Amino acid sequence: YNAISLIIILPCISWLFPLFFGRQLGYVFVTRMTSTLIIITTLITYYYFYQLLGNNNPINLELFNYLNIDYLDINYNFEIDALTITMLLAITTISSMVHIYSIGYMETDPHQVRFFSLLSMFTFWMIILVTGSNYFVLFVGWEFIGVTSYLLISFWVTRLQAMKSALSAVLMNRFGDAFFVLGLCVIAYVFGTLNYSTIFATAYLINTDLLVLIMLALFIAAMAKSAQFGLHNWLTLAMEGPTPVSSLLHAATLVTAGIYLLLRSANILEYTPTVLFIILWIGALTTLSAGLIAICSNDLKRIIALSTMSQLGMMTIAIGLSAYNLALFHLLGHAFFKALLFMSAGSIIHSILNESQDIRTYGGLLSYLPYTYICITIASLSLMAMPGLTGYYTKDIIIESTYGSYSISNYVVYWIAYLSAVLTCVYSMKILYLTFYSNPNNNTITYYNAHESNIYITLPMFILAIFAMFAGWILKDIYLGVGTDFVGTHILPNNFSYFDTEFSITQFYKLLPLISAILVSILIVVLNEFFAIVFNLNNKYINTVYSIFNQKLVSDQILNHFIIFKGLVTSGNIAHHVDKGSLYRLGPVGINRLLNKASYNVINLSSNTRSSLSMNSMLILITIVSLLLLVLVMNVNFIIVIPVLISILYILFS
Amino acid sequence: GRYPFPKDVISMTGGWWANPSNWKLNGLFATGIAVGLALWVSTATLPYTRRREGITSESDISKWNAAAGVWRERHGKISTGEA
Amino acid sequence: IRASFDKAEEPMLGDYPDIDPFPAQLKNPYKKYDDQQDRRNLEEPLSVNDDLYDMWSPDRFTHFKNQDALKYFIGFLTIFFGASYVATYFVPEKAAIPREFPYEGLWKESGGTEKSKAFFGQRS
Amino acid sequence: LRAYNEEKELALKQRLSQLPPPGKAFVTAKEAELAELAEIAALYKTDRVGILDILLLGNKHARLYRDNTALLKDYYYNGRRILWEIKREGAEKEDWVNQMYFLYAPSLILLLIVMVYKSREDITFWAKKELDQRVLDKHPEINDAPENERDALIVERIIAGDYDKLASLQKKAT
Amino acid sequence: MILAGLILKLALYAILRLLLPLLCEAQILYTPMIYIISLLTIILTSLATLRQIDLKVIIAYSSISHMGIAILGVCSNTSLGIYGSIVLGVAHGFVSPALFLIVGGILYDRYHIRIVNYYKGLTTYMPQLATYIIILSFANIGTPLTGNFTGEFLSLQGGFIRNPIIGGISCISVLLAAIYQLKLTNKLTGGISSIYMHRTNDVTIREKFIMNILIISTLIIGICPQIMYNLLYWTVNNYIYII
Amino acid sequence: EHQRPELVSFDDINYNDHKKVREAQESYTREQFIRLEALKTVRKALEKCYEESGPNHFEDCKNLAEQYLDMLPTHRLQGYLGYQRNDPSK
Amino acid sequence: HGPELTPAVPFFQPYVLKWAGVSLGLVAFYQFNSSYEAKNGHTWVETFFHPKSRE
């Protein structure tokens, strides 16, 4: 019995066996097989996390050599650090609950053998991504989770938008993959290794300019997968994949990988201030940008994907404050939250006979679906950091730490993060109002046929409601202590502001996000029922503004017409005007015309005369004349006879 | 839905609604292979695992630092912040 | 014809119909085509630079003019960074001193040498 | 090995002369004309000769053979495409599977096995053993240590001295 | 197949065998010209792949882009670059004739027309062909555990040694090699099955045999590139000129 | 059996016989691999130092870390061609 | 409520048999060499390695 190996081997069994034996076992068997095997993986890693609180003594396993070359070795090495077990328990919990959930949500779909297979390989390459013990195994899992995201978003190959959406997702992630290959080449150049242990032992000695270059490249990678503003479209362009897929890819996992890259490199992020600065301001941008999209969009899955990427900015702000236990704790609780959000959303999309996604056409469903209501309201109250739930403990202390930090400029992002929190209320109130409380918008027959979902849909929502209530109070001592030795990362002694941040808060700045996140929530509710004209004005100017914030702060357009389409035109310029146009004029298509003209001239040189004898007899004369005159010119100066011969060639060949 | 499909095509992951008649019988074989493979690979990678901290005794690490200091003295190499 | 690169391709073509390029997405979906997914009838002449006017082409939004949307995007960009940069000036000072450290700022503890006390050192 | 008969093969060609071409013999979209041809398909499937005959015999027999096998080959595969013919089983050997699964695949597994075990003799294993040998040569007293100490003691010398001799090869520089 | 698997790697061999031993003092003066032409054939051929109507031609320009990655590990003056160019050359010799089989054998023998616009939704009538098309697509890009990424990675690393700024724009090849390949792959793999293509046979046993061999032989080099270091550890040190 | 071929150099030999030039070539090559295994040994010891030390690795093995980062530019494969085509001090 | 089964297929398809047989044979042979090396000091296939001496 080996705990470190069965975390690896059991989701490999759960992936290889659905493909190799899917025709032989059938869907009814492979459902329960892939389910129970991820269940026992998840139980083994809870028991290992229980062991690891006893002694902080991680276990690694060693394998054969990937490559030995001169100054560089790469081994397959697998090590569950405290950071690794933190991410691991979250992703295995969300995975196993989504397996149980998608048993019942996919029972009418044909191809759920391939579906449960791909869910399991997504979990498996996530496992290898988390538990790897150099930068190489991190890269292997990092690429193959993007490969799975191709294979998962495009699950209905018949649908055109699903194929183009998986294309968009993979090519954004591959942009980030290219910058991580740049950063990884500089890693193996400067340190001569890829192992975390050797790089972190010598990170403080290395020059700062190199360090800025490396962490810039690795942050552009992390910014691509963890969905900040530079390429942020592909999350909400990944709603063409189904609901349990989007419960994996957005709640914990594919999102969490980009944060994991910075949480690993935290030990080599300390010694540069410039990178952490830029990290902080990108995250502070996308809290605001994603909240302002989520207010004004209207599809349910889009609003929960934007609700996801509003808090990725919050974790990125916690990175920029040099506070990695905060970002890790928020990354932990956020997974349980969003997974309950996506699965409550899929339960109300599944329950409508229309299976529509427009919140404008849901209408009141409070008395018809009380269970999905109580789930989604536990999730929304945790989502707004209403106290006594773990969103309070994950989320409000980051807003506290923006004011508590030593540097002056951090005060500004307080308000920005603060503004997002108020924004975090309002759209959530919309996706609690217009689908449960409002007057009905749908036709009457779906209100006849609205019923409760199966037991396979109910039980993961129950379990993750309990987790999203109790997880922060249980694990707060681990990640937010007065002094904690759990996560082995090493903050510089001045970037550490956690004793400073808890005490320097005035009563107003701490009391203020609590009370206003309460008040604005009740405000949006009570203004949605009684008046409903403030939100339904028809000013021409507010409709242009609303249509800006609707269409993703026009970002997709600014991505598509000015980068994608211009790129395709300039690639069409090369493939025609350069590749087939001008390289053939110096190539085989211009030489044919040159030789055609020159041969036509030198063949028609002896054309004109009726008599061959007089022509050849006058052609013998010109040469022994002309050669003799050339040699007269030639012994005097050789420079004045070169143009004469160029002109004789011009007249002979043209 | 249950729209009709062509049965001539054979895919390894099953086809559209793959449900063979002997799926309990084949499930017995698949549980056998999965349990045997998991137990065998878990026992095979047992000696390749090790604890992180406390593998070698601290006197060795202090001696290694001493030999590092000797090799650094022989070459006359300055520290990083000495300038 | 309509685009600029389509006009740039015009003097190259010879005995080719030179039809109007129209997006295959902005065709209406309810007219019956041969392929509903392509939105294209069986023998319909394909345009000068077809694969930009394909169904597999870019998304090609239609609600804003692209120059206008360029202005709105750069406007939100500039107003956020300008508001944050001006709000750096209206900041309050803090009430604590940044905290100090024993053993002359733990300089021996973070590597360090007596000659290298300034590069690896804390507040003391 | 095996042997063929001349007269049977002449009679085979005499059977084939009265038969339609392969482009007509099955295009009729039963057993009046379609039952003599599936016999002939089994006649293609059976093998007339072994190795001992092809070496020792002349080329007129061989030309008669090659014409027979070509016509039987067409009558087998055209009837397999339009419609022994009227069966549907699984067990079959395409012409290539004899010398690709039984010669190409095991020689490729043999290439894998010799690459894996030839990788034992590498410069890095040998150079690690050589550097340990040089440390044991200069300082033999660490021989006197017990098993677990000796490796660690060797490391304390590898750090404490270069043990290359690369400056001794470059004797033209100093 | 013999052209793109073997002739291009023959000239990759000839730049090692013939030039790097007796043109060393020349070769240092000219590595920036080789880096001009190498970066300029990675960027500008992989960008011309996007506008293609034909289907074998795309895999051809793909071979150009991978050899353009390959030769800047050869002229990198590094142990890493030489070994990465060899593992790229051998792994591309595996993965690329399989792609010319997929365009030429399974897809031109059946329909006899190579225009891309006819081919859509090949999954619903040929599932295991679409399985091949995707796992040979991803093996071409530089998606790891395949040996193509080992070649691309050690070649880009060796090219980053000798000049870092040429390696910075040389590294975007990981993006540019993915764009056209997955743009082809999702057009072949997905959609409603094409109204032009009538349904034909599944991939036969001989074609699956060729494919299985040419994919295992990438995966073995991808999981462990050390299996052929026993041949090269002399010839990685041989061509290096660092005085 | 762990056989050890003898070291010869580039400077005493004649370059007209090929027996000695190839031996000097292989000798300089194999010595670079020995020098490289010394580098790898210190990298292994530095990793063990870090994993045992925990938080005080800054002062436990500043010398091992500085040792590794000083060895890394000068301990790699260098090539016999550069020394045999050019002669120092001539 | 019925599963609505498709026709029965056998477990040990020819591909499962071939791929499992070759992989288990290679792993068993590798363990056989690791066991044979402890007895005699060298692997079994190294007895078949006969190159010429470098001298």
Ligand SMILES: CCCCCCCCCCCCCCCCCC(=O)OC[C@H](COP(=O)(O)OCCN)OC(=O)CCCCCCCCCCCCCCCCC
């Ligand atoms: C600290 C600094 C912070 C910097 C932050 C700012 C970063 C901005 C840069 C963003 C670059 C994004 C990456 C560009 C490649 C992405 C490719 C892609 O995603 O294509 C998507 C497109 C399908 O998308 P679409 O059809 O529009 O919508 C589908 C949904 N139904 O798929 C296709 O149609 C496939 C065919 C088109 C593929 C693109 C071809 C041209 C590629 C040009 C790449 C240019 C790379 C250099 C960019 C320089 C930017 C300055």
Ligand SMILES: CCCCCCCCCCCC(=O)OC[C@H](COP(=O)(O)OCC[N+](C)(C)C)OC(=O)CCCCCCCCCCC
């Ligand atoms: C896919 C899910 C993962 C499965 C993992 C199963 C682990 C089983 C135990 C590992 C034992 C081990 O590998 O040992 C390693 C052995 C001997 O090296 P060593 O020095 O003795 O030990 C190393 C430990 N050190 C460093 C502490 C000393 O070398 C090998 O085997 C390499 C053989 C490679 C063959 C080529 C790859 C073929 C793949 C083809 C795929 C189609």
